[PDB]
Design a protein around this ligand. Sequence first.
Ligand SMILES: NC(=O)c1ccc[n+]([C@@H]2O[C@H](COP(=O)(O)O)[C@@H](O)[C@H]2O)c1
Ligand SMILES: NC(=O)c1cnc(N)c2cc(Br)sc12
Ligand code: NA
Ligand code: NA
Length: 322
Amino acid sequence: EQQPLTLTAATTRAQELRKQLNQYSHEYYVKDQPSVEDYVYDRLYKELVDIETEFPDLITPDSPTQRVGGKVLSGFEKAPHDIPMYSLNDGFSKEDIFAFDERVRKAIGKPVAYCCELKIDGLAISLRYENGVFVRGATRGDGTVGENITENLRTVRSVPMRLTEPISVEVRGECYMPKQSFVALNEEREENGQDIFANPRNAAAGSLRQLDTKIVAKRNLNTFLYTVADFGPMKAKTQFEALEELSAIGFRTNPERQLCQSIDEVWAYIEEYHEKRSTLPYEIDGIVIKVNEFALQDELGFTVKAPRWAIAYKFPPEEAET
Ligand SMILES: NC(=O)c1ccc[n+]([C@@H]2O[C@H](COP(=O)(O)O)[C@@H](O)[C@H]2O)c1
Ligand SMILES: NC(=O)c1cnc(N)c2cc(Br)sc12
Ligand code: NA
Ligand code: NA
């Protein structure tokens, strides 16, 4: 009648199971290419649950079992941003974008390649990892102080609990509610006699600011990550490389990015994705254009208000394109 696992055996097995389950979840949710059928995942997940039940000391805050929600907070602690979450200067016309390029070429003294990305219209987030483990999730707030929504973000399945390497990094991006989920949610709320959300951004914000993680877990949220606060522990020397590296270590990144060699190529990208906007399952409010080379970003630096190496081209509001 003796239990099969010792504490040390249970500890090692739990570690193995967590690594495997984190991999499978990444494949299933982020790659959208699961290597195993659901029954395989479910089987290993149950084994972990049973270990954690028998040995509660082995439960880690980042374990796959901590994803499902249930915890309820009394309030959100403030979440300072030691490195500010800056906002970009905006452009609205072809003139604004070509003028930006002219200013960049003036400062650098040669043509400059640009990493072009979609500007995801959701809730800006910062994800802190310590030795490869998710330890803090925060909203942007005013860019200097946000809200600690760590537990809520654990329920968002695209957020990795562990990275492929044990690095410490502060990763920034957006969390959003897909358009199809938003419309469904609003109908559910209508039927419940609840106030509807004005748009998917408010719906994502409402969801991430719920104190009851069980409620948050029921909502459909996703993420795209595109930068870090400090590239010190990263190998990347360009923004395009940085996106590849973030994807490699386990973050969901947006696949529509393109490296452009001239501002004329940047313009074509802007035109391309204005047309593609309606076909995407997530909202965008424009296009972000960044000098690709980190060396050149460093040279350009920031003004008091924003980077001198990037601009956001703003499309008309989503509401103006039905
Ligand atoms: N096939 C897989 O690798 C895989 C990974 C994660 C979740 N799932 C499925 O998603 C559902 C929920 O699982 P989780 O709450 O652990 O994310 C279950 O039906 C599970 O089978 C499947
Ligand atoms: N891909 C990007 O750079 C990007 C996407 N979506 C956003 N809301 C933002 C905001 C800043 Br600041 S950058 C950025
Ligand atoms: Na969810
Ligand atoms: Na369209």
